[PDB]
């Protein structure tokens, strides 16, 4: 019926929002971060890999954290 496609698009976008916000609540009961998941630790990893000439044409950097 007229007005049904708009109800469908609104229901899909409301289902995406609820599941994503529920994931972030269950994450808050998870365990602590690993001790190596920091930018300070990840920049000494790159120090070791640049000496050993790691990945000489596609990149070796391990930096993905804050």
């Amino acid at each position: 019926n007229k007005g049904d496609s708009s109800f469908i698009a609104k229901g899909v976008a409301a289902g995406l929002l609820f599941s994503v916000g529920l994931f972030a609540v269950v994450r808050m009961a998870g365990g602590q971060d690993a001790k190596t998941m920091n930018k300070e630790w990840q920049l000494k990893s790159d120090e070791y890999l640049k000496s050993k000439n790691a990945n000489p044409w596609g990149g070796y950097s391990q930096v993905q954290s804050k």
Binding site: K35, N55, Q64
Partner: protein, 236 residues
């Protein structure tokens, strides 16, 4: 040599066998993209035009020309990529004139390496065990679940034969950047060959569910120069 965050491609290659594996992957994906381009286009332009067709063509039920043609076309494509896929299969199985052999044995959550060519100045068997460094003992900058307390040292530009077996259950000797993957079965010895073209450190892992410690059994390999390998060998 090492995996990287958000990577969507092969790790860089160090051997001619992994050079050829990548060449066959890319050759096949050329033709899988033509086929996906056709099927997704026909699907899209059929829904968009015949969802608004009020009179169906109910008297079209067969066609001799198209049905023969679309039975032959997938056979030609399948035959085109089988030619280089057969050549690569027999080029990697051959192990001709190697200069050294190394044995690797899998255990309940560690590896073990043996050199028995008796080239060192005192003519013994060089052997040691390799263990993952535990999380509590890591030094800052070392790589979690990858770095080991001892590693395997090999020279560059040398043909090497690997001999792989196991002691208790099935394991798997695997290093992505070298093009190596082979099961390690209690009772039999398999072999593989390699020839490394540059120096560096190459990381791998066990690839045959072996129990609770299946994730804590990594492989680390260092490739050095020939005078540097003889000095390391003659000491350890």
């Amino acid at each position: 040599d090492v995996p990287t965050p958000y990577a969507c491609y092969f790790q860089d290659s160090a051997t001619p066998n992994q050079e050829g594996i990548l060449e066959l992957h890319d050759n096949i994906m050329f033709y899988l993209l033509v086929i996906l381009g056709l099927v997704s286009w026909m699907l899209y332009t059929i829904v968009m035009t015949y969802s608004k067709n009020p009179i169906a063509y109910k008297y079209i039920k067969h066609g001799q020309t198209i049905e023969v043609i679309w039975t032959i076309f997938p056979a030609v494509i399948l035959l085109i990529i089988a030619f280089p896929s057969f050549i690569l299969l027999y080029l990697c199985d051959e192990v001709i004139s190697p200069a050294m052999t190394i044995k690797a044995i899998g255990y309940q959550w560690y590896w073990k390496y043996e050199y028995s060519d008796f080239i060192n100045d005192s003519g013994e068997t060089v052997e040691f065990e390799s263990y993952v460094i535990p999380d509590e003992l890591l030094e800052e900058g070392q790589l979690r679940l990858l770095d080991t307390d001892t590693s395997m040292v090999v020279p560059v530009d040398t043909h090497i034969r690997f001999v792989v077996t196991a002691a208790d259950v099935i394991h798997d000797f695997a290093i992505p950047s070298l093009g190596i993957k082979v099961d390690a079965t209690p009772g039999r010895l398999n072999q593989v060959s390699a020839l490394i073209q540059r120096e560096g450190v190459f990381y791998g892992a066990c690839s045959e569910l072996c129990g609770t410690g299946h994730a804590n059994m990594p492989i680390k390999i260092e490739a050095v120069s020939l005078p540097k390998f003889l000095e390391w060998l003659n000491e350890q």
